[PDB]
């Protein structure tokens, strides 16, 4: 149960994906439809409006899932690269009602990325039966941009 | 290791036209738009237009609206700029700059274009 | 959208804190705003974008921050290599304005 559920082959379509906010630029849109693991071309990353602690994308399942891990990816432009250091972890079952992912009775603090394009993996213990999830960024470089993945399997 | 290249000084008289050129090395023109901006003599930076070789649309800015053109020549990745009906006030500096990535990050050289009788 | 720029010309000595200013005609997203810096026959170089991301490169000494209509440029501790013109800049989807620029020059 660590298998990609549908982020990178597109599994989990481009409706599915939503976020709290994403940036638009002149002929340049990093949509959250955008955030998925080792995607190419112009934009290829889902960045928020503007950079803060309050910020979030997230995947709807659109089923129960048995969540194992996240993949992080960070991405660069032309020359700079952009990604996020740490995020944490919440899940809904109905997009409304929602819980972060506490280890040891504290929220958990997850390692993210520490370049544009080398993907980070993130296992979740214990692991989680939800439809929904969210990755909030907490601490980035330059800006938050990110393309994941989300691993595990169906919970039948 | 990108490189934005502009043509050569150009030297024109009122009502002509001139078209300058910006190559880029080390990346597809295609991924990414091409802005446009000029400085005259004494003066600020000042916005031309911008365009995307990507979809060949392009943007203008409200004083250049009807003397410039952007094109593209996607296979040799080179951006083109035509100022037309030139006018002795059009002397100035023109340069092209691309987002790195979201404003004017990377810079030609930039081309002087001077318009006198 | 219209920016304008204040001091015209900012004059200090090394080592001073220098603080340059943007004002806008229109509220707009912070993530819009770019601060450049140019020296004699020398093409423009961006300092910070997103008015307050600083570009690879650029010394921690530059800083931003500002919203809405008001956006700041400041520099800790002025070095001679500092002394040059600043001009801010909105950017966007629709269309892109510089201030007229501010000149920073020593206090001789």
């Known amino acids: 149960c660590s298998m990609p559920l549908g982020m990178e082959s597109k599994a989990i379509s481009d409706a599915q994906i939503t976020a709290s906010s994403y940036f638009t630029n002149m002929f340049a849109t990093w949509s959250p439809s955008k955030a998925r693991l080792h995607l190419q071309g112009r934009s290829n990353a889902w960045r928020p409006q503007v950079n803060n602690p309050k910020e979030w994308l997230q995947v709807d399942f659109q089923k129960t899932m048995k969540v194992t891990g996240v993949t992080t990816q960070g991405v660069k432009s032309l020359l700079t690269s952009m990604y996020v250091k740490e995020f944490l972890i919440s899940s809904s079952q109905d997009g409304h009602q929602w819980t972060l992912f506490f280890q040891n009775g504290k929220v958990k603090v997850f390692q993210g990325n520490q370049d544009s394009f080398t993907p980070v993996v993130n296992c979740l213990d214990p692991p989680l039966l939800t439809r929904y999830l969210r990755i909030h960024p907490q601490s980035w470089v330059h800006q938050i941009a990110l393309r994941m993945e989300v691993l595990g399997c169906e919970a039948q | 290791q990108v490189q934005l290249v502009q043509s050569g000084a150009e030297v024109k008289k009122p009502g002509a036209s001139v078209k300058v050129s910006c190559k880029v090395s080390?990346?597809?023109?295609?991924?990414?738009?091409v802005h446009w901006v000029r400085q005259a003599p004494g003066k600020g930076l000042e916005w031309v237009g911008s365009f995307d070789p990507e979809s060949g649309e392009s943007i203008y800015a409200r004083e250049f609206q009807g003397s410039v053109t952007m094109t593209a020549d996607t296979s040799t990745n080179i951006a083109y700029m035509e100022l037309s009906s030139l006018r002795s006030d059009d002397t100035a500096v023109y340069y092209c700059?691309?987002?790195?990535?979201?404003?004017?990050?990377?810079w030609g050289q930039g081309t002087m274009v001077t318009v006198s009788s | 959208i219209a920016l304008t720029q204040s001091p015209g010309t900012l004059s200090l000595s090394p080592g001073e804190r220098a603080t340059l200013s943007c004002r806008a005609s229109?509220?707009?997203?912070?993530?819009?705003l770019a601060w450049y810096q140019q020296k004699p026959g020398q093409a423009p170089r961006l300092l910070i974008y997103?008015?307050?991301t600083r570009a690879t490169g650029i010394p921690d000494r530059f800083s931003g921050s500002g919203s809405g209509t008001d956006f700041t440029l400041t520099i800790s501790r002025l070095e001679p290599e500092d002394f040059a013109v600043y001009y801010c800049?909105?950017?966007?989807?629709?269309?892109?304005?510089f201030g007229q620029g501010t000149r920073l020059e020593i206090k001789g």
């Open positions: 800049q909105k950017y966007g989807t629709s269309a892109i304005t």
């Open positions: 080390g990346y597809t023109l295609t991924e990414l738009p």
């Open positions: 700059a691309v987002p790195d990535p979201d404003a004017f990050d990377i």
């Open positions: 997103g008015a307050s």
């Open positions: 229109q509220s707009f997203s912070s993530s819009y």
